[PDB]
Enzyme design. Sequence first.
Site, short mmCIF file in Angstrom:
data_model
loop_
_atom_site.label_atom_id
_atom_site.label_comp_id
_atom_site.label_asym_id
_atom_site.label_seq_id
_atom_site.Cartn_x
_atom_site.Cartn_y
_atom_site.Cartn_z
N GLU A 85 0.79 -1.28 0.00
CA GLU A 85 0.00 0.00 0.00
C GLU A 85 0.82 1.33 0.00
O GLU A 85 0.38 2.38 0.47
CB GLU A 85 -0.97 -0.03 1.17
N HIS A 142 -5.07 2.60 0.90
CA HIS A 142 -4.31 3.56 0.11
C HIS A 142 -4.27 3.12 -1.33
O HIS A 142 -4.10 1.94 -1.61
CB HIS A 142 -2.88 3.70 0.64
N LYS A 169 -9.88 5.19 7.37
CA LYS A 169 -8.94 6.09 6.70
C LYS A 169 -8.76 5.66 5.25
O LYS A 169 -8.46 4.49 4.99
CB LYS A 169 -7.57 6.08 7.38
CL LIG Z 1 -1.14 8.51 4.77
#
Ligand SMILES: [Cl-]
Lengths: 245, 247
Positions: A85, A142, A169
């Site tokens: 990621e 991500h 997140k």
């Molecule tokens: Cl980050």
Amino acid sequence: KTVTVKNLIIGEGMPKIIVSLMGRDINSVKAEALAYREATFDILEWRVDHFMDIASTQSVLTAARVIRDAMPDIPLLFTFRSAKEGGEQTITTQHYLTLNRAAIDSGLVDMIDLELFTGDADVKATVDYAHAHNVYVVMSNHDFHQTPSAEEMVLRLRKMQALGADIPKIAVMPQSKHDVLTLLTATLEMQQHYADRPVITMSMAKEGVISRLAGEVFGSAATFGAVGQIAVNDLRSVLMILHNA
Amino acid sequence: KTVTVKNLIIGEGMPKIIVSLMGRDINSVKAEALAYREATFDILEWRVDHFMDIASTQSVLTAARVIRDAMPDIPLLFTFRSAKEGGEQTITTQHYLTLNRAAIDSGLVDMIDLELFTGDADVKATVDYAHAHNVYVVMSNHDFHQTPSAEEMVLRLRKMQALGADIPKIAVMPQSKHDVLTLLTATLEMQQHYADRPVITMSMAKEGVISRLAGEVFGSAATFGAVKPGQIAVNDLRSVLMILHNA
Ligand SMILES: [Cl-]
Ligand SMILES: [Cl-]
Ligand code: NA
Ligand code: NA
Ligand code: NA
Ligand code: NA
Ligand code: NA
Ligand code: NA
């Protein structure tokens, strides 16, 4: 809808500023923590993937202890960013699990970053382990190449909530200015319809900078600064100006 | 495609900061003009509709002259905001056009603000008159109740270009955070597909403040600050614009 760590309330007021440690070894980490004494920020993240001796759980815990003791009153987030990621080196899923569990049960960290795509059994087990030991989970995802659709991003954030993330997140790479707006749109759709806890979102790089500044408006609870990247004092300045507008 | 006024290149670099001067009478205009000299901004807008002697063309031009004499090197924008589009007082269309033509041919101002929906024939005539006297036109539209669709906003900005505006301008009222994103979307669509000159956009009110800060990213060439809703202190505005520009 908040997460409180060491008197910091994540998920209300101004977005909270995270700064990261990236040293290779004990002396480097000590020097960073010392240099960071002159800085003002809210959360300290240790980027474990930048550390050299990640093979030894003892080495990793000794460094965590040094960091914890250097800044005993700061919220401390333990983050191994997998190369998978966008991180600095590879790790096996089993060893990633070992390091995270050891950090959790050592008492040395307040929060851990756990990547959503690690695998379901491992994610569920690690979420449970964290919670049983009074550690919060920043569950993360991500894309350092491109920006998924808003629909896809919102579903990922919802899935993180369903899996028990304390703070979902997502960080994505814009390939256009339009992609920055897509990230803000997804963030807001969480804010106003599905979120029941704080969420962190970001569009990376120069193009995405506005997403690191506008969290109070569109619904991102924290932002990353440097002691695309933005200096912590400048970041603070903008967040305050927006907060008081 | 840019607009250069007294060495200020509008449409390049950081968004330019406009402040509005709003004195009710000649003594107040004089005082404000002198006091504004020490503030840092790029363009001075005189909000003529706040002036309570608009009945006299002489009084209006004398006030413009006082501002010009205090700030000889500042780009000066003459703006009567009509009551219809959120301004302070109702005057006839002919009165509005006469004031703008007198401002144009006086040589005292660099730019005028002309409202798009004044009427196409009157807008064309006034644009032509401005250009005949080397005055630039900020052509403007406002919705103080709601945010039109991105497509309606783009339609209006494109009509301003068709009518010869030097700088199209639209300001709209958000009813939600979503509406602020609509305004940014319209701004970007103009930037990347239709604009061939500088464009100014904003979402008004507290919720819209981010639109006053993010012009460099999405394509708004200027932004309004306050010397002393949404218009933040000019020094704070400048600080944010610089941080975004240099990031
Ligand atoms: Cl980050
Ligand atoms: Cl292991
Ligand atoms: Na981790
Ligand atoms: Na890896
Ligand atoms: Na245990
Ligand atoms: Na006018
Ligand atoms: Na009027
Ligand atoms: Na004439």
